[PDB]
Design a protein around this ligand. Structure first.
Ligand SMILES: CC1(N)CCN(c2cnc3c(Sc4ccccc4Cl)n[nH]c3n2)CC1
Length: 492
């Protein structure tokens, strides 16, 4: 449900909430790109800092995580010993705000809402807005139907009385979300039969590509970007798919970050593994396919370089995108899994030759030759695109170089008949990596359909996040994906 996240409270409001409405074990998370976990223990409120500069959520005195929901789930089911004394996350302190619900539109007239539902709704599309006739109340607007008169818009008053909500009779809810949830499971039936089924929120995030700059300006006033992003973050609770294989003891040492793991149902499975190793089928990587496909994976560790090259070989991948230096801020992010220029190396049963490096402003290109040892004729060229100028924290101020990069990469991939997924990695393989993949997916739509096409940035991000945890980490990357797509639209 993710209700333990309060998008707009203060520290003192968080302590007050935990001391007066929580008990020991009660907790909540809140933003300050930094966040805080606030936890009551022994009648006192502690605040634990979470940092995310773009690769993962770094929790002080804890582990690193792909999403806040996975962070909370870990410390609520595994012990994870969040210590400091031990800090236990027992009871979510739920937030009642509706401001990051997909169906909440706050300020919105009835005629604007009828038009929105008319132009872009279907039977069951709905939304909730602030009542204008009755200050303080709210309105639920639903579309139902099959301009032939076969459809209609129905409005329903939501009374707000003593901070509780109701539709004029029956139960009174502590939040608009509790009311919507309730009347989603138990639809409202009009007198003459029509059941007001709340099937899906009206989609407002989808735009036509030509109007990108207009939306980017809309999102840049008072900020709209943060609202839209945090409404996406609110959807991360639906993506807690199992990641059992990555948690196996034999696979623990193959994870760069212990708790950042691939979903079981999209992970890359490696076959033809030597039968000597009990578990030879595992790597930290997920197939990403827009629903050109991709593999999103972490930066190699010394002990997974051989498994990485089994992946590349097995999937017929011909292009690798690296978006990290080998070492950043003095810390290892990816071991050097390719040979020096002109050299030849064996990695297990795989052999790689670095044929030639080419240096451009933002990136180096390494032309690798990959084959299986003892089996001539399996050789194929793999092109390694190594973006080197990405900032250690945050994102670039201008998307130009990233776009020139992705364009080259796309043309290489397209030029190779029956090439496999493009491999993309950074350190953890979710933040820079998801940003680059999402940008590439959006640009691909436009490449094929021109500027006269529909794009939906959060929808695409959600779709990539169902295939690997936390794809796209921060609001800064979110804005950067917009800004990149804008700049691509204006170069055509
Ligand atoms: C006015 C608002 N308060 C409410 C409506 N708006 C949305 C709508 N949808 C989302 C998502 S998710 C998502 C989007 C598209 C398809 C599928 C999914 Cl799951 N994240 N943020 C969002 N904001 C903007 C802010």
């Amino acid at each position: 449900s993710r209700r333990w996240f309060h998008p707009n409270i203060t520290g003192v409001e968080a302590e007050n909430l935990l001391l007066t409405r929580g008990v020991d074990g009660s907790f909540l998370a809140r933003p300050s790109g930094d966040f805080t976990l606030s936890v009551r223990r022994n009648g006192a409120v502690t605040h634990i800092k979470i940092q995310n500069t773009g690769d993962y959520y770094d929790l002080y005195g804890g582990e690193k995580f792909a999403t806040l929901a996975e962070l909370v789930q870990y410390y609520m089911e595994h012990h994870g010993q969040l210590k400091e004394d031990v800090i236990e996350l027992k009871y979510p302190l739920n937030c009642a705000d509706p401001t990051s619900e997909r169906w909440f539109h706050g300020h919105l007239s009835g005629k604007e809402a009828e038009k929105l539902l008319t132009e872009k709704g279907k039977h069951g599309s709905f939304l909730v807005r602030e009542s204008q006739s009755h200050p303080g109340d709210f309105v639920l607007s639903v579309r139902t139907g099959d301009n032939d008169g076969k459809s209609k818009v129905t409005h329903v008053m939501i009374r707000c009385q003593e901070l509780k909500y109701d539709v004029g009779g029956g139960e009174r809810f502590d939040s608009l979300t509790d009311l919507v949830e309730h009347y989603k499971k138990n639809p409202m039936v009009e007198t003459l039969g029509t059941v007001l089924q709340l099937k899906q929120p009206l989609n407002t995030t989808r735009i036509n590509a030509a109007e990108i700059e207009s939306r980017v300006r809309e999102l840049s006033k008072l900020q709209g970007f943060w609202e839209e992003f945090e409404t996406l973050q609110q959807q991360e609770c639906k993506l807690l798919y199992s990641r059992k294989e990555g948690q196996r003891q034999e696979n623990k040492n193959k994870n760069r970050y212990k708790n950042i793991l691939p979903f079981d149902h999209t992970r890359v499975v490696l076959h033809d593994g030597d039968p000597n190793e009990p578990v030879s089928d595992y790597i930290n990587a997920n197939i990403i396919m827009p629903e050109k496909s991709y593999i999103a994976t972490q930066g190699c560790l010394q002990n997974t370089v051989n498994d990485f090259w089994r992946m590349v070989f097995q999937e017929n991948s011909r292009v690798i995108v690296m978006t990290t230096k080998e070492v950043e801020r003095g810390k290892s992010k990816c071991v050097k899994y390719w040979p020096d220029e002109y050299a030849l190396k064996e990695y297990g049963v795989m052999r790689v030759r670095n044929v030639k490096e080419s240096a451009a402003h933002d990136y180096t290109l390494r032309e690798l030759k990959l084959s299986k040892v003892g089996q001539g004729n399996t050789e194929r060229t793999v092109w390694q695109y190594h973006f080197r100028t990405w900032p250690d924290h945050g994102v670039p101020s201008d998307p130009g170089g990233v776009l020139d990069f992705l364009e080259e990469v796309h043309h290489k991939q397209e030029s190779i008949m029956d090439a496999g997924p493009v491999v993309v990695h950074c350190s953890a393989g979710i933040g820079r990596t998801g940003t680059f993949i999402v940008i590439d997916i959006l640009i691909d739509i436009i490449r094929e359909k021109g500027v006269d096409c529909d794009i939906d940035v959060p929808k695409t991000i959600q779709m990539v996040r169902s295939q690997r945890s936390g794809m796209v980490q921060t609001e800064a990357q979110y804005r950067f994906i917009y800004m990149a797509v804008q700049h691509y639209i204006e170069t055509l």
